[model samples]
Target: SKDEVTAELMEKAANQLFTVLGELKGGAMKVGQALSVMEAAIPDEFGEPYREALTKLAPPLPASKVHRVLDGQLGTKWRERFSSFNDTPVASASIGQVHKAIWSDGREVAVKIQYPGADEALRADLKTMQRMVGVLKQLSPGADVQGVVDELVERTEMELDYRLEAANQRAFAKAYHDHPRFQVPHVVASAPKVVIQEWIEGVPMAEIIRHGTTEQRDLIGTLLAELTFDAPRRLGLMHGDAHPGNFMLLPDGRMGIIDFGAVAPMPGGFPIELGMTIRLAREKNYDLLLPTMEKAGLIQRGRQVSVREIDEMLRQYVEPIQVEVFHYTRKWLQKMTVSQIDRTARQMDLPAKLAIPMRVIASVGAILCQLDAHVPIKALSEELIPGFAEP
Candidate 1:
C-alpha cells in the first residue's frame, strides 16, 4: 500500500463529485444565479467560456418532469391559464427554472417552477446516478460512494425545501410600483413551488456592457446606483444580493430590478449616522468624526488610533463618491487594496463585523467595475439617505 492515496482513487473520487454536481444543474443555473463564485472569475467580474464548454449544463428536469410539476402546482388543466407556454426554460436556478408564456389575459409572463419532489431529490436521483454507479464500477471496481450519495441527497433536500418567496417578492413589488426609472415586475400568479410575474423586456446588462454606447453604459451605472441606494430607505432593505446580473437595460433607458435574493434590513433602517460619518469623510472633518463614531459604538476596543490615520483611510475609501462623477475601474479597486488599508483596517474596526453593509457596497462596486461605468454617487446618495448631504 502507498503512504498516501493513489491518483487513481483521487480521480475516481473527482469523477463522482463532478457527476453529481453535473446531474443537479439546479444548484448554479444562470450566469447571475451562479455569480458569487463567478465574481472571483474574470476581469469583467463574470465568465461564460467554461459554462458553454460543458455540454451537460442545460434543461435540468426535461419537458416531461417540468410538465408534471406544472400539473401538480397549476393543476391538471394548467393550459387554460396560458395562451401559449414554452416547455423549454429561459433560465434555471437553485431550486427552479423560469419559462416564458403568454397569459390568457394577453400579458407576457414568466413561470418559474421548482423541480419535482418539490422538495425531494428522491429515487429519481437514484435512477440518474445508476448510470454513474455503472461508470464508477467499471472505473474503480467500486468505492465508498454511499457516503457521498447520502451527503449530496441531504444538501439537495435542504435547498429544494426552501419555498415561500411570494410574500417577500410582493413586498418589493409594492415598494417599486409605478416608479418612473425602476420596475419590479408584479407577481401575477403563485403557488407553493410555482410563480408567474410580468415578463421584463430589455437587453440584459451583460449585453450592454459588451457593446452599448458610452452614454448608455453611464446611464445604466447611474440607475443601478439609484436602485442600490434608494431601496434601503424605500423598503427598509438593502440590496445585498443585488448584482449587475440582477439588472437589465430597457429600450426606454431605465434599469430593471430582477432578483430580491438577499435584501438585509438594518436595525433602524439604513443607518443615517453611518451615512453622515461617510459624508464626514467626504467633507474632511475627521476631527469631530472620531468622537462621532466612538459614541455610537462604531469604534473597536483595541486600537488607540489617531484621527489623522482615520482620515487617510476613510478619505481613500470614499474616493468613488468624493468626485462629482467617479469612474469605477479594475485598477482603482486594486489600488484600494494597499498595505495602508491592511494596517488601517486592523487598527480601526467596528465592534461587530459589518458583514451585510460590506456586501451591499462590494456588490455595487464590483458591478460598476464590470460595466466600467461612471456615476455621480454623491448626488445619488444625498437623496437616498437622510442627513447625508447635510453633514
Candidate 2:
C-alpha cells in the first residue's frame, strides 16, 4: 500500500516536471528530456506539407535580435568579416539558431547564435526544477531528488557554453577527418555564445528514416553504432548528444555529427569492465562470473542472489548479442524491461559514472530499433569494446 502510494505520487510529480521542461523546450530539452519523440511514425498520407511544418518548428528571433547577438559575439563591425548574412535563421535548435553566411574569405559557413537569455533561463529553469523537488520530497519522502538535481544543473550549464562546443567540434573534425563513415564539419570561428562551422547541405536522419531504403537504414544504423562505441575507443571523445536533427546523411556518403555542447569527455574510452562482464555471461562462465559480479558490487546485498538467478537476469543481454546479426525491435526491448523489472531495479548498485556509457547505448539502441536494423552487435562489441574480446 505504501509502495503504491509512493509510486502514484512520484508519477504525478513526474508529470508536472515533464510538462514544465517541455514547455521551456530550450535548455531543459538539452538537459535531456526523458520522452523520446519517435518521428518515424509520422505517416506519409499527410505528406511533405506537414513534414515541412514540423521542421519549421521555431519562428526565430527578429532581425535586430539576431544582429545584436552577432555584434556582441563578434565585434561592433561584425558585418565587415561576413560578406553576406541571413537574418532569418535557416535552422534552430534547443538553445541556438543557425544562419547561413558567406565568410569574408568566401567560404560558405553556418553561423549559430545562442539565444539572448539562454544562459540566464537555463540556470533558472533548473533551479525551478530543483525547487519543485522540495514539494515532491515533502509529499513522498523521495530519495531521488537533491544530489541528482545538482548534477543535472551543472551538466546543462555546460551545454549553454558555445566556446566549449566550438572546441569540441574542431577536435571531432580533426579526429574524424576523411573518415570513411563519419563527418564532423570543421569549425570556422567561435565565441562564448556563438559559433560558425563549415556549412553542410545533407538529408537529416529523420528524412532518411522516413523514406530511405533498407540498405540506407542499415548503413545509418551501423554508422550510428560506430559513432557511439568506436569513436570513444579510438578518438577518446564521444558525441554526448545523438538526436535526429544532429545526424545527417551527407551527399558524400558520410553521417555528419553536429551539436557538440554536450560531449562525453572519455579520455580513457568506455569502461572495459562493462564489456568484460557481458562477455563472461555470454561465455557461460558462471563459476567465475558469480564471484566477479560480487567483486564488481553487482550482486545484491542484504538478500540472497543465486548464480542461477543471476544467469537468468543476464540473459537479457547475452541472448540478444550472442548472434552475429541481432535484429532490434521495440517489442524485444519492452519485453526485456518488463520481464526482469526487479533484475533491472537491482542494477542500481552500479557506480554512477557507468551510467554515461549505457546512456549512449540506450539512445543509439533506440535509433537501431526504430530502423529495425540488423546489426552485428557481437562482432562490433568485440572490435570496438576492449573488454568484450581478449583485452
Candidate 3:
C-alpha cells in the first residue's frame, strides 16, 4: 500500500504541480521559476517537477495577439518602424516573448512584446499566490512566504511597465558600454508594453554550463561576482535577476547581460554595514559581530540568540567570502541552503533592507555552483566593492 501510494499518488501530485503552474502564465509561471532556481532548498520529489515546468515556456499567445499588442502600443504603423519583423518568437517566457527584427534603419534588434492582458493576469496570479502561502510554507517550512510573495508582487508589477525597464536598461548600457569585461545592450525604443534593444549574439550561459572549459567557467564566475558587487556602487542599479538564462558568454570572452525587467534601484548604494558584518565574521570577532548585526537589525534588539548561534549563522554567509579562492559546487550550495533553512527555522530575523541583496547573493551563488567555478572571492570584492575590505 505504501509503495502504491508512492508510485501512483506521488506521480499524480507531480503532474498536477506541473500543469497548474505551467498553464497559468505570467505571475504564476514566475512563481514556478523562482521556486525552480531554489530547488536545492526543497525535496527532490516536488523540486524536480517544478524545475521541469520552468524549462517550458507558458503557451504563447497567437501571432494575432502579438500584432494586436504592437498595434495598441506602437500604433498600426508599428511595422513602419521595423523593416522586417518575425511573427514567431525567438524566445517566450512568463511575461512576454522576444522577436528578432530589423529596424527601418537597418539595425538588428530584439523586440520584447508583453502578452495581452499580462498586467491583469499577473495581478490575479499574485492574489492567488498570496492565498496559497500555506502551501508554500509547507514546501519550505522555514521560508518567509508572506515576505517573498509581497516582494514578488511588487517587483512583477514594476516589470509590467516596459518604459520603466527601458530607463533602467539605458542606465546600465551607458555605464557598461565599451567596458572590457561586460556587455549591456542599448535601448532602441520602448513603450509601456514593448521594449526594443540592440541585439546581442552569444552563447547563452546554459551552453557554458554544459560545455565550457574549466577556465571559462572560473572566469565567468568571477565576472558574475564582479558585476553583482560593482553594479550598485558604480551605476546605482542591481540587475536583480542573475539566473543563467539572462547572461551570455560572448565570442570575445565577455559576459553579455540581457533582460532588465527586474532591475532594482539602489540610490544609497549597498549597505555599508553588510560589508562590515562580513569583515567582522571573517575575523572571528563574535563579540563585536553580535552587536554589529543587532545594530543593523539582522537580529532584533531584544531577541534572545546565543553567541554560538549567531556565530554559526554569520559563518554560513561569510564562509564564501572568507577564502582567498572559493570553489562553488552543488554540494556546497546544498549544504549552505539547508543550513540557512535550519537557522531560519530557529527564528533568525532577516532584516527587510537585506532581502534583495541577500537574494541576489544567493541567486548568483547558486549560478556559480552550477558553473562549478573556482573564483577569487576576497580579492574580487576588495577590488570591486567599496568598503568591502575596510579595517
Candidate 4:
C-alpha cells in the first residue's frame, strides 16, 4: 500500500514538472546545465537521478527527429544539401545539434539543425518555470524570483533564435578579426540553420588540464581572460554563455570561441559602469558599489540595504573577479563561486541577472582549477578595465 502510494506521487510529480519542462525549455534547460556543475551541493534526489534526467533536456534530438526538424526548416531534400555528411553529431547543446559535412562545392561545413518546436517549448517553459522558481524563492525568503526568471527567459529565448546568433557571430568575427591572439568562427550565410566556418582542431580544455604543461596552461588562461574582459568591451555584446565547452585551444596556441547563441548586448556604456562596480567592490567601498549596483539594475532603488547585508553579498559575488586586488590565489577565487551558489540557494530569490554573472565566473573558475592555472585575476581585470595598468 505504501509502495503504491509512493508510485502515484512520483508519477504526479513527474507529469507536472514535465509539463513545466516543456513550456520552460530554454531557461529550465540552462538551470539543468547549471545544476550539473553543482551536483554535490544539491540534495540526493536532486543530485544524481534528477540531475541525469534534467541534463537530457538539452542534447540534440535523435537522427529521425533531426531529419524531421531539418525537413521542416530547410527543405524535404535537406539530405541532398550536403555532398558528404556525417550522421553522428560533432557536437550538441541545449538549442541545436551540429553535424560535420561537406558542401557540393567541396567546402567542409558544420550543419546545425534547430530542434523542432523548441521556440514554443522554451516560451511555455519560461512561464511555468517562473511559477515554480517563485514558490521556491518564497520558501527561502529574501529572494528575487521574478527578476531572476526574467533575466533567464530573455537570454534563453535569444539563444533559440539562429538569426540572432548569426548577427552575434558577425560582430565577434569583426571585433577579433585583426587580432592575432584569438580566433572567432566565420558565419556561413549559405547555411543559415547551420553555421559552417573554419573547423578548428585543438585539444579540449578538459583534456589540456590533464596533460598540458605549465606554459601551455598560462597561455590558455591568458586567452580565456581576454575573452572574459576584452570581447565584451570591444564587441559591445558579450557572449553571455562563456563556458570551457564553448572555448577551444588550437595547436598553435590561439583560443577559439564557438556557440554565439547566448550573446548579450549592453548599450550606453554598461561595460564602463561594470568596470567601476568591480573596482569599488574590490576596494570594499560599499558607497561606490551600491550606486554601481543600482546603475546595473542589480539592487532596487529605495530598498534598504544595510552595511552588513552589502558586505556579505558583495564578498560572496565580487571576490572571484577581484581576486588579484587582494593577491588571492586561483583556488581562493574558485571557492567564491561555490560559496555564491549556496548563498543563492539559501536566498532563493536573487535576480537571475545578478546570479548569471556569478554562474559565468564560477564556471570559469572550475575550468581554471581543473587546469591548475593560477591567474592574477585582479591584474586581468585591471588590464581590461582601462587606465588601471597605466603608470
Candidate that scores best on TM-score? 2
Across 1-391, the per-residue lDDT of candidate 4 in tens digits comes to 9998999999999987875664364233345543453343334553244334334343446788777766666677866756777877987756678888787677777777766666655655565555456544544334334466777776765666676777788888888886788888777642334455545657667666778877677677767766766765677665675666777787777987876777766442224555566567667778777876776665666677665555555564356555553322456655554532233112334454445444555556556666767566667776775423323
lDDT of 4: 0.62
User: What's the distance in Å from true for residue 313, model 2?
Assistant: 4.3
User: Whole-model lDDT for model 3 versus the true structure?
Assistant: 0.77
Candidate 1 lDDT over residue span 1-391, tens digit each: 6634687798889987776664343232333433443343323421333333233323477888788888888898899999999998899867678899999999999888886643534334443444344334344332334455565554444344333355556777998898888888888887867888889978788887878777777888889878776776778777655655778988787888776645566545566566777777777777867776665445654558666556655554478777889888777777766644333323333433254565576777777777788888878877786657883
Q: What RMSD, rounded to one decimal, does every model reach?
A: 12.7, 11.3, 9.6, 10.6
Regions of model 1 farther than 4 Å from truth:
1-59, 121-163, 306-313, 341-355
Per-residue error for 43 in candidate 4, Å, reads: 32
Error of 1 at 216 (Å): 2.1
Q: How well does candidate 2 match the true structure in TM-score terms?
A: 0.77
Most lDDT-accurate candidate: 3
TM-score winner between 1 and 4, please give it. 1
Q: After superposition, which runs of candidate 3 have C-alpha atoms over 4 Å from their true positions?
A: 1-62, 117-120, 123-156, 337-349
Each prediction's Cα lDDT score? 0.68, 0.73, 0.77, 0.62
Separate clash counts for every candidate: 0, 0, 0, 9
Q: Mind giving the per-residue lDDT tens digits that candidate 2 earns over 1-391? A: 9999999999999997886754354233322222222122223453343334334223567888888888788989999988999887888767778899999999999998888777766655565556444534443322244465777776776667777778888888988898998888899888977888888878778877778777777777777887888878877887775887788877767887876876887888887777887889988887777666666656655555666567666665676678888887778777766543353315664664466777777788887777776777878888888778864
Models ranked on lDDT:
3, 2, 1, 4
